[PDB]
Amino acid sequence: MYHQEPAPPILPLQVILGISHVMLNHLYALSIKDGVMVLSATHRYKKKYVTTLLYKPI
Amino acid sequence: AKWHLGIRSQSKPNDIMLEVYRAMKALSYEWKIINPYHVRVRRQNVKTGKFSKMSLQLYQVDAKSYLLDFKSLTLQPTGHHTMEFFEMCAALIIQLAR
Amino acid sequence: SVYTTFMKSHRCYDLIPTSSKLVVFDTSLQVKKAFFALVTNGVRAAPLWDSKKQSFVGMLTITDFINILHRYYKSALVQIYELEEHKIETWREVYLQDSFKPLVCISPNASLFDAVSSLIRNKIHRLPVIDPESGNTLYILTHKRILKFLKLFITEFPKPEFMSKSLEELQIGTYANIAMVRTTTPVYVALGIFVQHRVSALPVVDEKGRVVDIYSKFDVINLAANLDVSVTKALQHRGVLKCYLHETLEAIINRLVEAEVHRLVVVDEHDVVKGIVSLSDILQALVLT
Ligand SMILES: Nc1ncnc2c1ncn2[C@@H]1O[C@H](COP(=O)(O)OP(=O)(O)OP(=O)(O)O)[C@@H](O)[C@H]1O
Numbered sequence: 001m002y003h004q005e006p007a008p009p010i011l012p013l014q015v016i017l018g019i020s021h022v023m024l025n026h027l028y029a030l031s032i033k034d035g036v037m038v039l040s041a042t043h044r045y046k047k048k049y050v051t052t053l054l055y056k057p058i
Numbered sequence: 059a060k061w062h063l064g065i066r067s068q069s070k071p072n073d074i075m076l077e078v079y080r081a082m083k084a085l086s087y088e089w090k091i092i093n094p095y096h097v098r099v100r101r102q103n104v105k106t107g108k109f110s111k112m113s114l115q116l117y118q119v120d121a122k123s124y125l126l127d128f129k130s131l132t133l134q135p136t137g138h139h140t141m142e143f144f145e146m147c148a149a150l151i152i153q154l155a156r
Numbered sequence: 157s158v159y160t161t162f163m164k165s166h167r168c169y170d171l172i173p174t175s176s177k178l179v180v181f182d183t184s185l186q187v188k189k190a191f192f193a194l195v196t197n198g199v200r201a202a203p204l205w206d207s208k209k210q211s212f213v214g215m216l217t218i219t220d221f222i223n224i225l226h227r228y229y230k231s232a233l234v235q236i237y238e239l240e241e242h243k244i245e246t247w248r249e250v251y252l253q254d255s256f257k258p259l260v261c262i263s264p265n266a267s268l269f270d271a272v273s274s275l276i277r278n279k280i281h282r283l284p285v286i287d288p289e290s291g292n293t294l295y296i297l298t299h300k301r302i303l304k305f306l307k308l309f310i311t312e313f314p315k316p317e318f319m320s321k322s323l324e325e326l327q328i329g330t331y332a333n334i335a336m337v338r339t340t341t342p343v344y345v346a347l348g349i350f351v352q353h354r355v356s357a358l359p360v361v362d363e364k365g366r367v368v369d370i371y372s373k374f375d376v377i378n379l380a381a382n383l384d385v386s387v388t389k390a391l392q393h394r395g396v397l398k399c400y401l402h403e404t405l406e407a408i409i410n411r412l413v414e415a416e417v418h419r420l421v422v423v424d425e426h427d428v429v430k431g432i433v434s435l436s437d438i439l440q441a442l443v444l445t
């Protein structure tokens with residue numbers, strides 16, 4: 001990413017309640033209710049998988 | 059329980075695209091287009107110096123509905139990838155939101 | 157010894173499970189709102205991300221809600237505690253918490269021993285494991301987590317001699333000046349002592365001095381959602397586990413780990429509390445010793 005100038009592939013994962021099902025490294029989130037946004041995302045450290053939630057206000 | 063992936067817009071893809079380029083330029087990100095449904099975006103971190111990066115991929119989920127997707131890239135550390143991700147995604151979504 | 161050596165030779169990484177959830181709050185969150193998020197997510201604490209400092213600044217734990225409830229109380233504003241909406245940020249700043257008690261954390265690569273000293277030296281109950289490369293809190297280390305892991309080894313390996321001696325022989329646990337309440341005691345009193353003494357739980361005892369229950373910090377804040385009430389009255393808004401000095405270290409550990417509790421109330425033949433044995437107690441004696 002070095003510049004500041006300007007058939008969408010179909011999507012089969014979309015909503016959730018195993019890891020690939022969640023897609024490692026992809027942003028997930030909840031319906032923003034009551035002025036608070038919840039993000040989630042799963043990452044790998046070596047052999048381990050942490051699914052991190054961030055509770056954020058707007 | 060109701061965990062939605064990325065964000066869902068219904069505006070036209072090219073439009074959508076521009077909206078994001080605009081946001082990003084406002085949010086003061088620089089990007090590299092990889093194609094009209096994928097961009098690699100980057101953000102300098104002023105306190106840190108280091109950059110944070112992520113991938114935008116547009117999808118179609120219906121015929122009248124779309125889905126924009128965010129993906130991450132690469133004594134306390136200065137620099138917190140997962141948090142800087144979340145923050146980068148948040149700022150955009152807010153910028154877009156309104 | 158052998159347990160000490162085990163702990164100097166294992167990385168915190170080692171007891172991180174394969175999958176794990178970590179809930180983080182932005183310190184710009186509303187204490188009140190956070191409290192619910194702790195609850196809905198079924199966790200007792202959370203890491204605090206401070207967006208402006210661009211960092212993890214510490215933990216939101218039950219003591220922090222206690223410290224705040226107390227302030228309202230000291231101000232005769234207890235009626236308001238329920239209703240307020242100051243940010244976590246605000247209150248931590250009130251106490252200059254980030255500058256005075258800065259975050260204590262550890263590397264995935266540090267020894268389990270190191271983590272045990274860490275928690276004890278700093279008198280804390282939670283310890284963030286943070287990848288120094290990425291800056292990501294991988295997972296949070298508790299005494300219970302640390303002990304449970306060690307117990308697996310304990311059982312699959314020959315015990316030392318002293319693992320058979322008794323609490324009394326070993327002199328493990330706290331037996332002087334036990335903070336306890338009485339059936340009748342005013343919740344507000346417990347508050348007072350929680351704040352002043354830095355213990356987690358209080359044995360509820362009868363006139364004879366026998367343990368009938370236990371009041372925790374949680375119980376206090378849980379209520380606040382009047383305070384002159386009977387500890388006993390409050391408890392109608394909801395585990396006590398016993399042990400004796402005749403009991404062997406080994407027997408104790410098994411119960412503490414298998415049982416899921418965070419401490420045992422030591423008790424004589426007629427249930428008259430004599431002391432408390434906790435996880436720090438266990439883990440200090442096995443490991444730091
Ligand atoms: N890693 C840490 N770094 C800095 N401060 C911490 C850390 N962990 C906890 N604290 C602080 O220490 C105080 C005591 O919390 P601690 O977790 O030790 O006991 P607690 O309130 O009973 O919580 P818990 O349910 O985890 O026992 C709180 O003010 C908390 O914010």
Ligand SMILES: Nc1ncnc2c1ncn2[C@@H]1O[C@H](COP(=O)(O)OP(=O)(O)OP(=O)(O)O)[C@@H](O)[C@H]1O
Pocket residue numbers: 281299300329330333334335336354355356357358359418419432433434435436437
């Ligand atoms: N009601 C009490 N009165 C006096 N001392 C106590 C009481 N409860 C615990 N202690 C002692 O105070 C120290 C801290 O105990 P506490 O249970 O708060 O910490 P811990 O057991 O290390 O943490 P955790 O409960 O997470 O294991 C321990 O050494 C324990 O023996």
